[PDB]
CSV table of C-alpha atoms in Angstrom, one decimal:
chain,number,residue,atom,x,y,z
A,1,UNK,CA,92.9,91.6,91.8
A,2,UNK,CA,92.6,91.3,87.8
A,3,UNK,CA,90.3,88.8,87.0
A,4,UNK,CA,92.3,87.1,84.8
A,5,UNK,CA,95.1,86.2,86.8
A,6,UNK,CA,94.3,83.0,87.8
A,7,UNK,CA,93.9,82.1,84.3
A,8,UNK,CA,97.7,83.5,84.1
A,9,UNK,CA,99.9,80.1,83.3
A,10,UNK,CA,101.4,78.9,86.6
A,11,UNK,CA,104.9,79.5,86.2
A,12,UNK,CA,104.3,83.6,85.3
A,13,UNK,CA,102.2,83.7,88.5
A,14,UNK,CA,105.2,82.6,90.7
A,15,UNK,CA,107.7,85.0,89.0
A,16,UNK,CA,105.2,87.7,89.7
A,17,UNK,CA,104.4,86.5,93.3
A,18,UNK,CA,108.1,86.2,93.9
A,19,UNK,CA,109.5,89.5,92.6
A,20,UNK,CA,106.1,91.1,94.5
A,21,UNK,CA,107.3,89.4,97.4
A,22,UNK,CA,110.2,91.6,97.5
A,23,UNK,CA,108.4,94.9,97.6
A,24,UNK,CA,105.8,93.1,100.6
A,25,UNK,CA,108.1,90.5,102.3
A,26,UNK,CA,105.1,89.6,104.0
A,27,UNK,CA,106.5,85.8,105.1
A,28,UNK,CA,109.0,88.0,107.3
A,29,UNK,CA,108.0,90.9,107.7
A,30,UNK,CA,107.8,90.9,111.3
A,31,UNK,CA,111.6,90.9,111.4
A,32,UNK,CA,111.7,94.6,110.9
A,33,UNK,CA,109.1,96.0,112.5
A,34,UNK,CA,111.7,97.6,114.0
A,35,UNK,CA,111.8,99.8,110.8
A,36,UNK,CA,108.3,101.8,111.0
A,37,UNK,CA,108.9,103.6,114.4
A,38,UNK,CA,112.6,104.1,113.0
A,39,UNK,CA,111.5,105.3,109.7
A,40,UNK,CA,108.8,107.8,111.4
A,41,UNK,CA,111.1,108.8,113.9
A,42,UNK,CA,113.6,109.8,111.0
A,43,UNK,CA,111.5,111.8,108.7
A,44,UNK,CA,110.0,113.8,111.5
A,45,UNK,CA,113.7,114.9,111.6
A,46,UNK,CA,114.6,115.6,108.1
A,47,UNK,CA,110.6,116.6,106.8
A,48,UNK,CA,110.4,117.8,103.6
A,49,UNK,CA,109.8,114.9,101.1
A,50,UNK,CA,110.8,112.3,103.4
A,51,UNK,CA,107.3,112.2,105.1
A,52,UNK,CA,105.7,111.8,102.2
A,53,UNK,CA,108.0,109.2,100.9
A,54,UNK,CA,107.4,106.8,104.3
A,55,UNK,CA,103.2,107.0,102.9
A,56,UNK,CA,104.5,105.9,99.8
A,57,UNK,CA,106.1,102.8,101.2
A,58,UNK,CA,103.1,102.2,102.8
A,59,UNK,CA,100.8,102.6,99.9
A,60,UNK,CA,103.1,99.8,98.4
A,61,UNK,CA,102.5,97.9,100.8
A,62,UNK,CA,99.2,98.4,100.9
A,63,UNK,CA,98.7,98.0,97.1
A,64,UNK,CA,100.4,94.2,97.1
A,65,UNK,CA,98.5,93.2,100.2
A,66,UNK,CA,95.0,93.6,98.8
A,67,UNK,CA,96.0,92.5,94.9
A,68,UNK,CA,97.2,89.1,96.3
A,69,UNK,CA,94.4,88.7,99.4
A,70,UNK,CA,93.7,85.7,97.4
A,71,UNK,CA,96.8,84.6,96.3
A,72,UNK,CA,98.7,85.4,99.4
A,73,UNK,CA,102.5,86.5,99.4
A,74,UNK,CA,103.0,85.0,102.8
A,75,UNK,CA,103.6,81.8,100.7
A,76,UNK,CA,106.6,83.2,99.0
A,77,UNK,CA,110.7,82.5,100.8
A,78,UNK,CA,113.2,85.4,100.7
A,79,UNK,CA,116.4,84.8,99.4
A,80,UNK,CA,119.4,84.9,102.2
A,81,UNK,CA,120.7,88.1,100.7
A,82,UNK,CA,117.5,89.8,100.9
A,83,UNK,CA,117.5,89.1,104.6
A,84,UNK,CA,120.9,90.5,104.8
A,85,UNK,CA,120.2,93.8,102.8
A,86,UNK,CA,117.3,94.8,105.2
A,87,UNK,CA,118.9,93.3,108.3
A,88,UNK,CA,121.5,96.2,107.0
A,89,UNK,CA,119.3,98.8,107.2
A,90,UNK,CA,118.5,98.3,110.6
A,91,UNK,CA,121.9,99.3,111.5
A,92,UNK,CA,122.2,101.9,109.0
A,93,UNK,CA,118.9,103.3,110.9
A,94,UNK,CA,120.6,102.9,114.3
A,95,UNK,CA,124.0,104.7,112.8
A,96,UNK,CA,125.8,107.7,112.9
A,97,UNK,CA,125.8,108.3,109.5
A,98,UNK,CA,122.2,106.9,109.3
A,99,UNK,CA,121.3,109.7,106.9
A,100,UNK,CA,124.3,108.7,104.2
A,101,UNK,CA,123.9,105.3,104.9
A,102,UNK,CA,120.2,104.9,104.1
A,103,UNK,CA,120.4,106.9,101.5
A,104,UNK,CA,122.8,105.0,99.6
A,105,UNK,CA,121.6,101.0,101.4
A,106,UNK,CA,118.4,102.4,100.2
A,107,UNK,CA,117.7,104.9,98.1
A,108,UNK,CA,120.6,103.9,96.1
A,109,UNK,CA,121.1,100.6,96.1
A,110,UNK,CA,117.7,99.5,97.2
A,111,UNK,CA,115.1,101.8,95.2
A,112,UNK,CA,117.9,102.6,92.3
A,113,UNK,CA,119.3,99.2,91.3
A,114,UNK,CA,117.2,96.5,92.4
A,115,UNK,CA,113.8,98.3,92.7
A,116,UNK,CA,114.4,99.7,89.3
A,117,UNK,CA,115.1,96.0,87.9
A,118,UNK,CA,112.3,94.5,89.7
A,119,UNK,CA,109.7,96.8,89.1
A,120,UNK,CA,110.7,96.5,84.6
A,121,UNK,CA,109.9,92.8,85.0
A,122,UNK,CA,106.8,93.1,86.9
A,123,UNK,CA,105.8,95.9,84.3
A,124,UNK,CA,106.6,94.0,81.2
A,125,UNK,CA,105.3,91.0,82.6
A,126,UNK,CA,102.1,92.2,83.5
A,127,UNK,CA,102.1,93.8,80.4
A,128,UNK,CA,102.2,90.9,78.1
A,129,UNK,CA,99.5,88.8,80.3
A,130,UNK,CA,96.9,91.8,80.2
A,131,UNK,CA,97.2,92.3,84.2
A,132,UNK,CA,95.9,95.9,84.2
A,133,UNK,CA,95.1,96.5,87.4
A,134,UNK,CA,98.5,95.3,88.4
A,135,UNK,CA,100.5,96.9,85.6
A,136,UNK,CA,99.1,100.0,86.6
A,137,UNK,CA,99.6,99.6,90.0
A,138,UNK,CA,103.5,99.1,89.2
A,139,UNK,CA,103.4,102.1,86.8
A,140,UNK,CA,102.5,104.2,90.2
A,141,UNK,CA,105.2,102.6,92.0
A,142,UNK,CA,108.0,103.4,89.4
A,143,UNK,CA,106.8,107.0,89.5
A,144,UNK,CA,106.8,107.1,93.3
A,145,UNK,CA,110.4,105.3,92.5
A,146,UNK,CA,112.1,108.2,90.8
A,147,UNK,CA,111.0,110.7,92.7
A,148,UNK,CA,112.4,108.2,95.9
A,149,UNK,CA,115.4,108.2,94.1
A,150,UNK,CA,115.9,112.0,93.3
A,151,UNK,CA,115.3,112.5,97.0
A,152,UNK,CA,118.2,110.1,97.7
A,153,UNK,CA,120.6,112.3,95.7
A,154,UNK,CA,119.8,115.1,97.9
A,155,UNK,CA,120.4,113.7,101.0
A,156,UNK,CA,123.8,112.6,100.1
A,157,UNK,CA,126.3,115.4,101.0
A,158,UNK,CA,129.7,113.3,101.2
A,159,UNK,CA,129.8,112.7,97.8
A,160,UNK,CA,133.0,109.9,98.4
A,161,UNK,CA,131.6,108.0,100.9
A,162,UNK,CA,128.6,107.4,99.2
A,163,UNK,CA,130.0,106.5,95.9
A,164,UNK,CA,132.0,104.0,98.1
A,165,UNK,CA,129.0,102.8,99.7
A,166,UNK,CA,127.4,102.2,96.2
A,167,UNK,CA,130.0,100.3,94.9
A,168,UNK,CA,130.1,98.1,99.0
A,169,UNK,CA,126.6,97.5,98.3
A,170,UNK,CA,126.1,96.5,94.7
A,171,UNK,CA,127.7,92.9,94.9
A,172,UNK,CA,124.5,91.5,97.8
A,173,UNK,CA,122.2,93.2,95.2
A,174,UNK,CA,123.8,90.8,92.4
A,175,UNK,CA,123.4,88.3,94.7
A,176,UNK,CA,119.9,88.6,95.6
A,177,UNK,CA,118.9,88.8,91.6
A,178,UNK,CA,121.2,85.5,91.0
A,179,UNK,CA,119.7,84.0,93.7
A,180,UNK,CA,115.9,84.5,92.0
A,181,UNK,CA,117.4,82.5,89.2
A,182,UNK,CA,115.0,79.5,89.0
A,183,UNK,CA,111.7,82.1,89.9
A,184,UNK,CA,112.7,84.6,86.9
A,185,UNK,CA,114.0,82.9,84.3
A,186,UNK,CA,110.7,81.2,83.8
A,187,UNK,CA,109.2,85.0,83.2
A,188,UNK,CA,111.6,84.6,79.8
A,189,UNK,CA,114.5,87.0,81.5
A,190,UNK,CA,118.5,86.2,81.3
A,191,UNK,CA,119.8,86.6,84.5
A,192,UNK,CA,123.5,87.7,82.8
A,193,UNK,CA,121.5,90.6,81.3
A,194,UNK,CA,119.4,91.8,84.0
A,195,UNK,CA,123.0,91.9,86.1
A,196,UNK,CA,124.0,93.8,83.3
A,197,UNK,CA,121.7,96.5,83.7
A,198,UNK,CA,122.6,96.7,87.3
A,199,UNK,CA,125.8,97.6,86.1
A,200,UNK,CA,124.6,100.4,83.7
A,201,UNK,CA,122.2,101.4,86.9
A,202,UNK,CA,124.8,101.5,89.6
A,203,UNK,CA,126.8,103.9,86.7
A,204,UNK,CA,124.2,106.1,86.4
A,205,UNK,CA,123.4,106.5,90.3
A,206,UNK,CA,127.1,107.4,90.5
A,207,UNK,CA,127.3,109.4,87.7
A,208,UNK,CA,124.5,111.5,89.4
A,209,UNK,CA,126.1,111.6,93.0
A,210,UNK,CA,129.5,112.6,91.3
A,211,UNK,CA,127.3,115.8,89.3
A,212,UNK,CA,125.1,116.7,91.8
């Protein structure tokens, strides 16, 4: 952990504890432990980067669980749209278009929109209160990000369904941003404008399936 983030003022520390929360769920986890051997089982399949991509999520995991082993995320309630979007990707695991349909729930929606958003306020915020080890440790994850999210594009082959699937998705990951409200504004962010990225984010995933 940095040294100085208990000297962080209060209000920044939940913010950051409650946006980290939602890359290591860890009050309810357990609900999807469903997802490891499904996750394993699906990348054994499909190799290339997909292997490396399930270490990453674990060395994300891995990376918020020992920076808060003092300040434990366990404390920290999903929102009910949260629980929705992952309860989703369950199913999408257990479907017949599981490929297309995690790599849009996912990839797309998951890693490209709300990941993307997420991970700019953790980095600014850490940023401005001189968190170093943290801000770097978000800098990795946005790298991993992109290259989570280039993968995505090349899994999608039905380039319809997915875009359709984008645009099904996007209003729970409004949702689950709008419901943060009272936890993020505090950090100094408009929630009007960080759903207006989401917009510009969701056109640009699109754009990119629609090109590829």
């Amino acid at each position: 952990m940095d040294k100085n983030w208990f000297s962080t003022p209060q209000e920044i520390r939940e913010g950051i504890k409650y946006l980290s929360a939602h890359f290591y769920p860890a009050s309810i986890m357990d609900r999807w432990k469903i997802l490891k051997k499904l996750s394993f089982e699906k990348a054994k399949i499909i190799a290339n980067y997909s292997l490396q991509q399930v270490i990453e999520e674990i060395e994300h995991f891995d990376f918020f669980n020992e920076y808060f082993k003092e300040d434990p995320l366990t404390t920290v309630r999903l929102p009910p749209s949260y629980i929705k979007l992952f309860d989703g990707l369950v199913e999408d695991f257990q479907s017949s278009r599981w490929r297309e349909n995690i790599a849009t729930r996912f990839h797309m929606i998951t890693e490209g929109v709300l990941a993307t958003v997420g991970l700019k306020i953790l980095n600014e915020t850490s940023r401005k209160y001189n968190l170093l080890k943290f801000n770097e440790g978000i800098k990795r994850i946005i790298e991993d990000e992109a290259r989570h999210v280039s993968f995505g594009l090349s899994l999608i082959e039905d380039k319809e369904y997915a875009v359709k699937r984008v645009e099904e998705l996007f209003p729970l990951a409004v949702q689950i941003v709008k419901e943060g409200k009272d936890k993020i504004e505090p950090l100094g962010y408009s929630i009007q404008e960080l759903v207006n990225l989401m917009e510009e984010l969701k056109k640009a995933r699109i754009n990119k399936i629609l090109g590829s």
